[PDB]
């Protein structure tokens, strides 16, 4: 027992402390988003009884992609609750024994409580919800995704964040992809994240960069932007997250103006960010929510603008269910290919502080509520990739 090392149990984790836990609803880049929240509470399911023979068991709690099952029988009893994730194969809809030719037997544990065990569960599904149809089959459908190993794209070098940088894509897993650059050093990113392009996407754009292709339509498109009146212009002050320090927004200028709404930014070393990025904040957005704004190399907008002879970028340039204390799994974007038990610990409208469980505050993240860096509990477990415990 004490030889079987298997690393992080959020079912133990979760069960001693009454958390809760984001759930799977909150995240739009993950399997089954699609067909959630028809799993709910008192849902009713067959699975593998392990006191290769089934029974029916209900939700009593949901936990991003993990249920807490109760064997039908138990009632109240709640000593044999188990945890399922429900990506896994042995989770089944009621009426799957009989299409299978599969036996439902009840736990041992109960097995003397009645004689009519079909009567009683008869009773018990009267007007019950099970798993939608084709739902293990859906799943994997939408887990075969458009990258492929050997693709080539342009990614924003670590290194060096002014520029992108030729990568081939190694490993794809659950949208998470492992890059190679052309020319032992390797880059985790989402399928998603705005640090990946086309190839010829920084020639076009005015993006600098160091110098078979994945097609354009395999990368997630941007926003469009309205305003009324002028567009960003250089020189223009803002506040944006530092992408090389995530617990850090910073004040920041319009470095340059590139094609198709995309920006260099600099801390008073240019990253780009879309002018649709939840990354950027008017000026004094720190300092009206309560946020540590850190300061260029008692900061105040007023007089920095005039030491400065600057403008505020206009607010009119700027453009979901979570809650402080909520469990998820959040990649340390710092060493990315690490994916870590996390809380959230702030919530400011659209915008995320997610604290890893163990570790410093230093080490905490802004990240918008959106970002595709932000996975449900049971979602490591679902993809077979490995969670850091706390």
């Not at 949901?62 to 109240?76: D, I, M, Q, S």
């Not at 084709?134 to 520029?163: A, C, N």
């Not at 941007?222 to 617990?247: C, H, Q, S």
Request: with cysteine; aromatic share 12%; glycine share 6%.
């Amino acid at each position: 027992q004490d030889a079987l090392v298997l690393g992080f149990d959020w079912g133990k984790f979760l069960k001693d402390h009454s958390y809760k836990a984001a759930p799977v609803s909150c995240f739009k880049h993950v399997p089954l988003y699609d067909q959630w929240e028809d799993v709910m509470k008192g849902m009713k399911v067959e699975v593998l009884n392990s006191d290769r023979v089934y029974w029916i068991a209900s939700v009593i709690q949901t936990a991003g992609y993990r249920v807490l099952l109760r064997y039908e029988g138990f009632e109240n009893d709640a000593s044999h609750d188990f945890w399922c994730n429900l990506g896994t194969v042995d989770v089944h809809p009621i009426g799957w024994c009989a299409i299978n030719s599969k036996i439902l037997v009840p736990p041992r544990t109960i097995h003397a409580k009645f004689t009519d065990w079909k009567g009683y569960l008869m009773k018990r599904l009267v007007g019950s919800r099970t798993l939608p149809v084709d739902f293990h089959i859906k799943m994997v459908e939408s887990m075969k995704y458009p990258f492929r190993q050997g693709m080539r794209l342009e990614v924003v070098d670590k290194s060096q964040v002014s520029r992108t940088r030729m990568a081939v894509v190694d490993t794809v897993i659950g949208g998470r992809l492992r890059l190679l650059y052309e020319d032992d050093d390797d880059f985790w990113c989402h399928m998603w994240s705005p640090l990946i392009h086309p190839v010829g996407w920084s020639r076009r754009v005015g993006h600098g960069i160091k110098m078979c292709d994945a097609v354009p339509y395999l990368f997630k498109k941007v926003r469009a932007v309205y305003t009324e009146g002028g567009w960003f212009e250089e020189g223009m002050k803002l506040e944006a997250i530092d992408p090389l320090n995530l617990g850090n927004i910073c004040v920041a200028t319009v470095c340059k103006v590139l094609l198709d709404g995309y920006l260099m930014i600099c801390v008073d070393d240019w990253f780009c960010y879309h002018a649709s990025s939840h990354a950027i904040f008017p000026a004094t957005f720190c300092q009206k929510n309560d946020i540590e704004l850190t300061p260029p190399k008692t900061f105040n907008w007023e007089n920095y603008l005039e030491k400065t002879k600057s403008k505020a970028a206009p607010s009119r340039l700027f453009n979901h269910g979570f809650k402080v204390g909520m469990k998820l799994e959040a990649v340390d974007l710092m060493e990315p290919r690490l994916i870590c038990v996390a809380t959230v610990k702030r919530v400011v409208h659209r915008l995320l502080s997610i604290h890893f469980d163990g570790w410093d505050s230093e080490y905490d993240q802004w990240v918008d509520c959106e970002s595709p860096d932000i996975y449900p509990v049971g979602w490591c477990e679902l993809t077979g990739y490995q969670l850091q415990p706390p």
